[PDB]
């Protein structure tokens, strides 16, 4: 008891400092950054806000609970106040409440007091200049609080932050003028709590009412604030719309646009994983392997944790349907390994041309196939076994009888033996010629050609268009 009682005081001072000065220096600094320059944006405290939010998402967040200075909620949410020279007095009132909190119990517990608190900024009337400061002062307690998952009486409080964000959405439909430089930070912050829309709604069932609401927000941002807005909202669309049918494959067709410019960073890569599974549902394997590889290869630096391992998991799925895959056991991480353990023997069965080896993988690992969600291609891969199996043996064997190859091709009658190779040439597999009497399959090859034209002529536009973009970057980054 004395140890646990005296170890309570040490923890709070760290949130009492960094959690106090995180939105004070970044938010209060963004106030001066929003008064002028305001180029672009930039508003570098918006990306610094991303660093602080992602910092809280690990440790320590804020709420909890935690029974440490719950008076931080009324601190920033009250006392604009009101015009800038009067706000300076309230800038001293934060220090006044620092002394009040340094004297008495400092209101270490709020809970049901969030009802007057969250409505106090509406009692001030008003900030009135910066809506992102009002939305952030209310959300910063509540957004990390969603990670508690208590599911009692505070879920509707998260919904109240969603209503405050809807007031941020109506103000996202009006001003401007003309030229809002704070709406990019509103795109950032709202995309977060739009994913908190996803989490809080997913506590019970699908959000479908918010699918028409997201389409209302996604379309009302057109065309003005779509920049960096439409990208995050399209992932908010694509993610759960990939979980719930339907039509998103043809919906993103008419939705594009592209939509440029890609922001922010890994956002477009993860979008190419989301739409990567989409474009993989059309089964064209050149665009699917390029969108899946570009999804993972374009994402630094992690941690955390396993969904960046999931894009790598589903990445080589289209490579399994290509007919040739390397053994990936050397790419296993300490985490991704234990997650894909069935998928290991799966791609090992894809390398081999044995049917029973692949079918036993299906019967045993079908439970993990339910966990991943990819099924339909597991039964049709038997056609990849007959095409890779015939690619194997044909190129392999000098002249193979249709009765001897019939074991690995499982039928290979005297009739279909013609089509196996012939319709493989239709798919561009093997050139083997067969004169059918008994018969026997005599595989030869003569090709000397290509390896030339498209690679070098495309490399011209590749390199040139690249260095042109690198011009568009460097030439435009010299403002300082």
């Amino acid at each position: 008891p004395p140890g646990g009682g005296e170890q309570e005081p040490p923890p709070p001072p760290a949130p009492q400092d960094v959690e106090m000065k995180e939105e004070a220096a970044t938010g209060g600094g963004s106030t001066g950054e929003a008064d002028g320059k305001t180029a672009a944006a930039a508003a570098e405290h918006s990306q610094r806000e991303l660093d602080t939010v992602t910092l809280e998402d690990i440790k320590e967040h804020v709420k909890q609970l935690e029974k440490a200075v719950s008076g931080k909620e009324p601190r920033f949410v009250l006392r604009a106040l009101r015009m800038l020279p009067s706000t300076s007095r309230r800038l001293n009132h934060y220090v006044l409440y620092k002394a009040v909190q340094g004297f008495f119990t400092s209101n270490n517990a709020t809970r049901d007091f969030l009802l007057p608190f969250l409505e106090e900024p509406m009692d001030t009337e008003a900030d009135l200049q910066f809506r992102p400061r009002t939305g952030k002062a209310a959300s910063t307690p509540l957004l990390p609080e969603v990670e508690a998952y208590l599911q009692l009486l505070v879920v509707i409080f998260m919904m109240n932050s969603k209503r405050y964000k809807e007031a941020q959405k109506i103000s996202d439909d009006l001003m401007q003028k003309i030229s809002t430089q704070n709406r990019r930070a509103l795109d950032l912050v709202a995309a977060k709590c739009y994913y908190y829309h996803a989490r809080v709604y997913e506590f019970l069932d699908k959000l479908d009412v918010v699918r028409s609401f997201l389409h209302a927000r996604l379309r009302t941002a057109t065309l003005r604030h779509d920049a960096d807005g439409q990208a995050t909202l399209l992932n908010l669309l694509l993610r759960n719309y990939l979980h719930y049918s339907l039509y998103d494959q043809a919906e993103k067709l008419v939705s594009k646009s592209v939509f440029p410019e890609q922001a922010n960073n890994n956002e477009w890569a993860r979008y190419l994983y989301y739409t990567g599974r989409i474009k993989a549902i059309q089964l064209e394997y050149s665009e699917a392997r390029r969108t899946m590889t570009n999804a993972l290869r374009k994402a630094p630096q992690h941690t955390a944790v396993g969904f960046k391992q999931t894009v790598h998991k589903l990445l080589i799925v289209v490579e399994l349907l290509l007919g040739e895959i390397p053994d990936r056991l050397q790419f296993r991480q300490p985490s991704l390994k234990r997650s894909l353990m069935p998928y290991f023997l799966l791609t090992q069965a894809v390398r081999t041309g044995n049917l029973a080896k692949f079918n036993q993988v299906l019967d045993q690992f079908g439970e993990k196939f339910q966990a991943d969600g990819t099924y339909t291609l597991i039964i049709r891969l038997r056609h990849n076994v007959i095409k890779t199996g015939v690619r194997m043996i044909s190129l392999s064997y000098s002249r193979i009888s249709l009765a001897d190859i019939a074991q690995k091709l499982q039928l290979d009658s005297p009739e279909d033996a013609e089509f196996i190779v012939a319709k493989a040439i239709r798919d561009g597999v093997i050139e083997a010629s067969i004169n059918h009497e008994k018969g026997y399959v005599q595989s030869k090859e003569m090709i000397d050609i290509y390896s030339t034209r498209e690679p070098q002529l495309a490399f011209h536009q590749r390199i040139s268009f690249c260095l042109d973009i690198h011009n568009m970057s460097v030439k435009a980054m010299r403002f300082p």
């Binding site: 992602t54 998402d57 956002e267």
Partner: peptide, 24 residues
């Protein structure tokens, strides 16, 4: 990041090759 997506979730052979001789 931690932002965005990720926080959501013939043998060798020894014996058989030596046996091929004495098989036939």
């Amino acid at each position: 990041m931690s932002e965005k997506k990720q926080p959501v979730d013939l043998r060798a052979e020894l014996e058989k090759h030596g046996y091929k001789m004495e098989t036939s």
